[PDB]
Amino acid sequence: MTATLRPYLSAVRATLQAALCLENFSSQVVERHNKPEVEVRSSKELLLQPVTISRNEKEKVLIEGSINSVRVSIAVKQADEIEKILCHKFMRFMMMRAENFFILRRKPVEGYDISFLITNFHTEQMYKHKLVDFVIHFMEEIDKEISEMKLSVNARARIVAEEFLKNF
Amino acid sequence: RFRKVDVGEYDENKFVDAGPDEGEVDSCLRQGNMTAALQAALKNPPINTKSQAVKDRAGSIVLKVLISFKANDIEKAVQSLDKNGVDLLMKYIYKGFESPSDNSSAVLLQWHEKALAAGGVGSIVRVLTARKTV
Amino acid sequence: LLRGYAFNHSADFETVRMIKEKLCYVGYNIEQEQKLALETTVLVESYTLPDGRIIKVGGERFEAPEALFQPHLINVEGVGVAELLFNTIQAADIDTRSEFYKHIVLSGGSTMYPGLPSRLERELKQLYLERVLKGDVEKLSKFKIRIEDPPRRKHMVFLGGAVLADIMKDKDNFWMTRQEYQEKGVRVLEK
Amino acid sequence: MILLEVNNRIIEETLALKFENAAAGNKPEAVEVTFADFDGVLYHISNPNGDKTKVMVSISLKFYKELQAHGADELLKRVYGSYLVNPESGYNVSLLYDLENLPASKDSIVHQAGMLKRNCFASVFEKYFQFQEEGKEGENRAVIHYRDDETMYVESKKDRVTVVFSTVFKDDDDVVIGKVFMQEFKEGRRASHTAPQVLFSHREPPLELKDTDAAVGDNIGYITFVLFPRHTNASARDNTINLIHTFRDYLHYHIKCSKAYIHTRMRAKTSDFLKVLNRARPD
Amino acid sequence: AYHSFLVEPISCHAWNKDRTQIAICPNNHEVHIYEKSGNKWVQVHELKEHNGQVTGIDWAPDSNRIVTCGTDRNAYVWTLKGRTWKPTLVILRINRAARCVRWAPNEKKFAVGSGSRVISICYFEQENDWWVCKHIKKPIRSTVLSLDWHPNSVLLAAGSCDFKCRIFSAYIKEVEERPAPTPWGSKMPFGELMFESSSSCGWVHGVCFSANGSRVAWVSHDSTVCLADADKKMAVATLASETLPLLAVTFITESSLVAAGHDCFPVLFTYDSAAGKLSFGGRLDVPKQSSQRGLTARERFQNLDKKASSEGSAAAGAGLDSLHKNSVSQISVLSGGKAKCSQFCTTGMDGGMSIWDVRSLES
Amino acid sequence: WXAXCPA
Amino acid sequence: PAYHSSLMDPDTKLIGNMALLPIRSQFKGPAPRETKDTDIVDEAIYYFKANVFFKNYEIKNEADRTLIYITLYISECLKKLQKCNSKSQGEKEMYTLGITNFPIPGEPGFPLNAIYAKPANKQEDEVMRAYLQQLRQETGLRLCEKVFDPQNDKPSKWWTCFVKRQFMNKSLS
Amino acid sequence: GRLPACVVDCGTGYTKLGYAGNTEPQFIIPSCIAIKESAKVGDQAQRRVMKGVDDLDFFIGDEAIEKPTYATKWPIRHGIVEDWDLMERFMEQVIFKYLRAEPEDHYFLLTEPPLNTPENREYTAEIMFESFNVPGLYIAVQAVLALAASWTSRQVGERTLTGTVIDSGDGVTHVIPVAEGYVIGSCIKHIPIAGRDITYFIQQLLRDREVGIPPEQSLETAKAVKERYSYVCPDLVKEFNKYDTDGSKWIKQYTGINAISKKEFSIDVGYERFLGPEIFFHPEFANPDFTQPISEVVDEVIQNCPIDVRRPLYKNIVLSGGSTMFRDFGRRLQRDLKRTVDARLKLSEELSGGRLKPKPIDVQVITHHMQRYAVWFGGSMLASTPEFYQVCHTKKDYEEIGPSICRHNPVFGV
Ligand SMILES: Nc1ncnc2c1ncn2[C@@H]1O[C@H](COP(=O)(O)OP(=O)(O)O)[C@@H](O)[C@H]1O
Ligand SMILES: [Mg+2]
């Protein structure tokens, strides 16, 4: 990935590492709470400006910021309709069992592909560099997964065709 | 039909809270002194100005100046700068980075890599926590 | 139970008391909190049962207090605590409405839920905006409310009784003395 | 199921339940049920009148008019004997069982009635094959578009027979999947010896269909199967007819099966992803 | 000198006069006290009547009183009566939350950096047997995260999250007397804004004062360090680097400076005399850490079931002590005051504690 | 009513 | 629970906690003779076929403790009698089981010891000892007359099937 | 000549099947599903991943029992389902082989237990709209279908919407009242004990009280319950001593046939003739958590709803469901409810004196056919109603809003 994806991964990793810093802030607007600030979007005091790391029109990522949480949204490089369908289904099956992850959301941001979430409650009970490493690894392995799914469906079609044609 | 309406019309302050030129940059470009072109591009930032015109002008000029560079003197260009200059640079690259199309990716990525090699994560922190619309 | 746990009505009724005390909380805006719950799973939390069993509760811990403002959830034709308060204040005279609104107390241990004052004040402001000013927000700015929430909201009646007995003990003409009981045509001694 | 069956098991089951208690006296067991099967055709079983001693079965064929115009006198005596009567429901072939007369056979009759749709469908293809076999002047080509908006065309000339398929996909999701499915249909031949040639065409309709008002458009593919006597004789005729008739539902079912297969694969990969993630939690 | 007191994080820490007792918040609705035993630590007491989360503790060198300032909009002043601890209810008139607290050198008043856009100051009263509370709300526009006090106890700096780090002037005539002349200003009455930050430089997470009371320094989320030198004409010095944001402030002497945060290890700074510029000092704590592991035949198969078998606990942060020391919460001092500080301690969000030295390095 | 009493 | 005890008049005496309800027996003990065939053991045997199924028992009256103890001992009696061969052998086994030393209430080795009381004085100790011995002997004599049948001279499967259905999930052992 | 829709009543037990506008569910098959799984050990990172076409190499239905080389694995467990891939495989197999219905040109109605979580319904609806591309879908509780089917008992023309239904199930039996078409949301309780654990208890007792059966053919032996072999009992101990006294005429015998060696084996019938069915009113035998009867639960749920609806509800209790086929069930329930309600009325009258005498509350239990299946006819009438074609969720609704359209529940609202 030295000449194709390495710089993009390095830049996004540095951005995440800088924006992975978090702290606990007692609720300032609603009685007594410590709920995530990014989702609520109550006070502009805590929010930080969004950032994007991208190299092509159809692929993108977004990096948010706040005291309580940092939100990241990705957009995959999908070209053909089969790629879009497979990505949507795979992400949906990932959603259906997102409880064990403790990091992932429950529905992607509108107009974008899957997005993750971090919080001060997920930074001490879990390691720090491991989470960013996993996000990176997912970003790389998505293309492998989609290509493998494509070849699998092609093989299935071939085998069914061969099985039917033999009778003739 | 009650809570439907917002009640968020408060009073507590929800944190209620010099552009660049073109002729000099063009002269530097045609003369070939790319370092002078970049220096002029970074000069006179729109730190205090509320108008999309100057913002887009600065973004376009910095993008055009950066694109023309080659991947041999980028280190020299970055080195001949001050730390505040490096931060302002990185801010400009991030600003123009959203600009898609016209293959404005690779050069920006190399610039970001060099800035990290020199500016460090502190530049990322500063750009992320700067309510200042730059 | 829906979540899939079977519970009795003998002792587990007391078991859920601690879980409600720790995890259960009330919201500020129902829509935003519901969207957060259905879009995220950070609000999930548990508690260690006496037998060591572990249970997950992330969404049920939020809608239970909502019955206070929406008695419809539990088969009651209620109107809501905030709406009831607004109606009661309005039905009174005029000179007393402002004084009642200025001074208000949140008494009782069941009101110790975190976030109830915010929900109540927001609801009252919404009622004032919609049923009086018809959405005129400009005139709504000066309206003021200060909920009285003493730190000792777990026990305040005992304080009142103690202070009353402090000064109402020397004089014997306050109580239903034992002597009056032996007579007929009695009771309703004072009111 | 891999090869979609042709015997509707609903009629088999209901007739088995009826006949297993047939020899139990005056047992009418009034029945009135409506069914549906592939090709968008509706079945109907109902007694003709208050007399429950007779059970009737009917069809609602979409292209029935073509069958009536062609004439199926062969089908009126070969497979179905005297237990066929004029149409009642919608001018479509309807049969009935005479319970008063002793039914000798039990499985053969049920099996014969099970393939009603294909039994009536064959009246045209088998007759065209007979035309080309008998040496009679090549009967005029015909087009048979069934309930689906797509169309079917057949040409029966000397020394060989031809058949072409038109394909239409409704939902945008399955269009590309079906295109991929049929792309490899025209090439898979390394496991078949005595099999016909297969080809796929979508942009350029075959020159045969230019004059015929068959399925013509943009998002419509074409499939043609070349026919030869080595696989269209009196022995290998029923198998070929069953395969071609069950072609559409076969494609559909295997598309859904592939969808389930990919669902299972992604579900399996989620476990690996979770295992990779678990490296972040402490010991 | 690393040590561990609990796996889960710890909110705040407080120490006694002799450095023999410790206060550790277990990140739960209570607070614990740890005491020395030879060269070992062991629990002694267990104080709990607060139904919320504790987020601020402090200790009185002489009064031996402890204050729990946290959630529930309340605050209890603990006092020792024989061999047991008892509470003391206080009233603060808060509606959102309270995070940080701090007593005074003379032990006459304490302040709370409440999250309700207000700063509260309280003093002892024997009349009603209560703790009366005043409020400062004029310039404040957001939450306050750090509070520090001045020897005379009349000047207070309350860092906030609105780009400002401002000194105040609180003087309760009931329990306060006129302070001596100060270079800053006139020691004006309670509830007023003395001066504000020169410009916008990130948020504020800490503040530090000086014995001479002529220099103030604070840190920010923008990887910046400031030093408000009031001896000159309000000379302001600034410095920056590539380090991650700092979350603490303290100095040794009139020129030195110490800080720590998400960098996972201490960072040292210094201030010039007349140049009006700071400098940098790298890893004054120690050169670097080390890493080790083991076979663990059981683990080799246990990890493969959930994680990858070849995986392990090794990390890039092991070499530079950046593996387990997850972030730094705040800082404290050991000996004397902010003059020599022969030793300095720091808190960690990892749930542990550690000590350091300033002379054992011996340059 | 609008002012005074409900109706 | 639902099928709790019965036949307990207030005049009945007690020994610390238990109810010294008379039992009719030809043996000797600190109990009187009741002419009616009805007694504690008869009701216990009558209701044992169902008490085991239930998983709770509220002690409405003091006789509930007697019912619990008698059923608990009957469980062990059935367990030990399943391997019987002759009526004489079964009677011998039941007799040698009655004259034993089982955990007395108020001492270790006794289930649900919390519910029962702890005797303090000396005399009540042997009073309870004799009462429990008499109850055990009467239970043994009562089981042997119905557990066996005139034919096959073996324990009926119907009466030993409940061997594994230990009351309250545990037995004396 | 509009095509009829499709009616399906999925569940833990025998899954009903057939088409709308018909008077008999044509196909009634178990939920048993085959699979070509075997003994791999890596079963938690590749559950199956069957190579090639072996994935579909599995049978279904009654034919799936007699395949002794695969695994019979029931996907459902009292409503909740762990893995739904088997459910999708079963659904495709049924729709294609048995129903032979094209999803793209048909409407499907599905039934789920009231306790089914929103997530399962949302995801099954998503699966349907994605794979089957069904134009319309609709899911509703089975109580109303039973109420509609109950009209056939007598006087169909006489409209009677009020009542209450206590339906059975392989793993769940629920209580749901109806008040003139509108049900009460909060007055619903879920009973975990059902017609399966009863058989578990039967076989557990039998494995010790008798011998002469093989381990494999146990459930076929345990299915004496489905035969005439279980009567309910007003009293428990009375019949216990009746059996322990005579034990000659009341005992029955079994003459089952082995399915392997074709060797006859017989065993007697004992106390289980009544204990099983009696467990319904004494659930404490099986489930220790739920020590609560049924009749008192019925009265409690009927006493937690408005006054004006309490009276007609007691008059209409429907006997629908397989587990309710036990004889004399209605008599016991009616007698118990009458006793408790009369006692409550007498207590209420005692506190306030008066020479009056309120008209006694009438409680009646109705016995009729359709008890085995009361959901299929309801679904048929559901499909036959034109308004169904309008209320059914459409494709475009699922296209961008998502599968949340099917999340509507009768016990939720904000
Ligand atoms: N005649 C019967 N006698 C006893 N039990 C029966 C009888 N018919 C059905 N059952 C029982 O009722 C259960 C089926 O009830 P049913 O509700 O149709 O299953 P489901 O919940 O999947 O719809 C079966 O497990 C069966 O044991
Ligand atoms: Mg059911």
JSON list of N, CA and C in Angstrom, two decimals, chain C residues 31-51:
[
{"chain": "C", "resi": 31, "resn": "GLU", "atom": "N", "xyz": [-37.56, 12.91, 21.97]},
{"chain": "C", "resi": 31, "resn": "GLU", "atom": "CA", "xyz": [-37.15, 12.59, 20.61]},
{"chain": "C", "resi": 31, "resn": "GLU", "atom": "C", "xyz": [-35.64, 12.39, 20.51]},
{"chain": "C", "resi": 32, "resn": "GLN", "atom": "N", "xyz": [-34.87, 13.33, 21.06]},
{"chain": "C", "resi": 32, "resn": "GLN", "atom": "CA", "xyz": [-33.42, 13.25, 20.97]},
{"chain": "C", "resi": 32, "resn": "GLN", "atom": "C", "xyz": [-32.90, 12.01, 21.69]},
{"chain": "C", "resi": 33, "resn": "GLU", "atom": "N", "xyz": [-33.41, 11.74, 22.89]},
{"chain": "C", "resi": 33, "resn": "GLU", "atom": "CA", "xyz": [-32.94, 10.58, 23.64]},
{"chain": "C", "resi": 33, "resn": "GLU", "atom": "C", "xyz": [-33.31, 9.28, 22.93]},
{"chain": "C", "resi": 34, "resn": "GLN", "atom": "N", "xyz": [-34.52, 9.20, 22.36]},
{"chain": "C", "resi": 34, "resn": "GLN", "atom": "CA", "xyz": [-34.91, 8.00, 21.64]},
{"chain": "C", "resi": 34, "resn": "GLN", "atom": "C", "xyz": [-34.04, 7.78, 20.41]},
{"chain": "C", "resi": 35, "resn": "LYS", "atom": "N", "xyz": [-33.75, 8.86, 19.67]},
{"chain": "C", "resi": 35, "resn": "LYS", "atom": "CA", "xyz": [-32.87, 8.74, 18.52]},
{"chain": "C", "resi": 35, "resn": "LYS", "atom": "C", "xyz": [-31.47, 8.31, 18.94]},
{"chain": "C", "resi": 36, "resn": "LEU", "atom": "N", "xyz": [-30.99, 8.84, 20.07]},
{"chain": "C", "resi": 36, "resn": "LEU", "atom": "CA", "xyz": [-29.69, 8.42, 20.58]},
{"chain": "C", "resi": 36, "resn": "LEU", "atom": "C", "xyz": [-29.69, 6.94, 20.93]},
{"chain": "C", "resi": 37, "resn": "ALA", "atom": "N", "xyz": [-30.75, 6.47, 21.59]},
{"chain": "C", "resi": 37, "resn": "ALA", "atom": "CA", "xyz": [-30.83, 5.07, 21.98]},
{"chain": "C", "resi": 37, "resn": "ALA", "atom": "C", "xyz": [-30.85, 4.16, 20.76]},
{"chain": "C", "resi": 38, "resn": "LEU", "atom": "N", "xyz": [-31.62, 4.53, 19.73]},
{"chain": "C", "resi": 38, "resn": "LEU", "atom": "CA", "xyz": [-31.72, 3.70, 18.54]},
{"chain": "C", "resi": 38, "resn": "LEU", "atom": "C", "xyz": [-30.55, 3.87, 17.58]},
{"chain": "C", "resi": 39, "resn": "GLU", "atom": "N", "xyz": [-29.73, 4.89, 17.77]},
{"chain": "C", "resi": 39, "resn": "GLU", "atom": "CA", "xyz": [-28.57, 5.13, 16.92]},
{"chain": "C", "resi": 39, "resn": "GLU", "atom": "C", "xyz": [-27.25, 4.81, 17.62]},
{"chain": "C", "resi": 40, "resn": "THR", "atom": "N", "xyz": [-27.29, 4.50, 18.92]},
{"chain": "C", "resi": 40, "resn": "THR", "atom": "CA", "xyz": [-26.08, 4.27, 19.68]},
{"chain": "C", "resi": 40, "resn": "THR", "atom": "C", "xyz": [-26.40, 3.32, 20.83]},
{"chain": "C", "resi": 41, "resn": "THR", "atom": "N", "xyz": [-25.35, 2.71, 21.38]},
{"chain": "C", "resi": 41, "resn": "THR", "atom": "CA", "xyz": [-25.48, 1.75, 22.47]},
{"chain": "C", "resi": 41, "resn": "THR", "atom": "C", "xyz": [-24.51, 2.06, 23.60]},
{"chain": "C", "resi": 42, "resn": "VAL", "atom": "N", "xyz": [-24.19, 3.33, 23.80]},
{"chain": "C", "resi": 42, "resn": "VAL", "atom": "CA", "xyz": [-23.28, 3.70, 24.88]},
{"chain": "C", "resi": 42, "resn": "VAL", "atom": "C", "xyz": [-24.01, 3.76, 26.21]},
{"chain": "C", "resi": 43, "resn": "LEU", "atom": "N", "xyz": [-25.30, 4.07, 26.20]},
{"chain": "C", "resi": 43, "resn": "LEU", "atom": "CA", "xyz": [-26.08, 4.19, 27.42]},
{"chain": "C", "resi": 43, "resn": "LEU", "atom": "C", "xyz": [-26.37, 2.84, 28.08]},
{"chain": "C", "resi": 44, "resn": "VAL", "atom": "N", "xyz": [-25.82, 1.74, 27.57]},
{"chain": "C", "resi": 44, "resn": "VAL", "atom": "CA", "xyz": [-26.06, 0.44, 28.17]},
{"chain": "C", "resi": 44, "resn": "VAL", "atom": "C", "xyz": [-25.30, 0.32, 29.48]},
{"chain": "C", "resi": 45, "resn": "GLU", "atom": "N", "xyz": [-25.95, -0.25, 30.49]},
{"chain": "C", "resi": 45, "resn": "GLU", "atom": "CA", "xyz": [-25.35, -0.43, 31.80]},
{"chain": "C", "resi": 45, "resn": "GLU", "atom": "C", "xyz": [-26.01, -1.62, 32.47]},
{"chain": "C", "resi": 46, "resn": "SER", "atom": "N", "xyz": [-25.34, -2.14, 33.51]},
{"chain": "C", "resi": 46, "resn": "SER", "atom": "CA", "xyz": [-25.81, -3.32, 34.21]},
{"chain": "C", "resi": 46, "resn": "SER", "atom": "C", "xyz": [-25.61, -3.13, 35.71]},
{"chain": "C", "resi": 47, "resn": "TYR", "atom": "N", "xyz": [-25.96, -4.17, 36.47]},
{"chain": "C", "resi": 47, "resn": "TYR", "atom": "CA", "xyz": [-25.78, -4.18, 37.91]},
{"chain": "C", "resi": 47, "resn": "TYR", "atom": "C", "xyz": [-25.58, -5.62, 38.36]},
{"chain": "C", "resi": 48, "resn": "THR", "atom": "N", "xyz": [-24.74, -5.79, 39.37]},
{"chain": "C", "resi": 48, "resn": "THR", "atom": "CA", "xyz": [-24.42, -7.12, 39.88]},
{"chain": "C", "resi": 48, "resn": "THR", "atom": "C", "xyz": [-25.53, -7.58, 40.82]},
{"chain": "C", "resi": 49, "resn": "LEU", "atom": "N", "xyz": [-26.23, -8.64, 40.43]},
{"chain": "C", "resi": 49, "resn": "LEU", "atom": "CA", "xyz": [-27.29, -9.18, 41.26]},
{"chain": "C", "resi": 49, "resn": "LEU", "atom": "C", "xyz": [-26.70, -9.91, 42.46]},
{"chain": "C", "resi": 50, "resn": "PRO", "atom": "N", "xyz": [-27.50, -10.12, 43.51]},
{"chain": "C", "resi": 50, "resn": "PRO", "atom": "CA", "xyz": [-26.97, -10.82, 44.69]},
{"chain": "C", "resi": 50, "resn": "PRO", "atom": "C", "xyz": [-26.46, -12.21, 44.39]},
{"chain": "C", "resi": 51, "resn": "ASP", "atom": "N", "xyz": [-27.06, -12.90, 43.42]},
{"chain": "C", "resi": 51, "resn": "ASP", "atom": "CA", "xyz": [-26.64, -14.24, 43.05]},
{"chain": "C", "resi": 51, "resn": "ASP", "atom": "C", "xyz": [-25.50, -14.25, 42.04]}
]
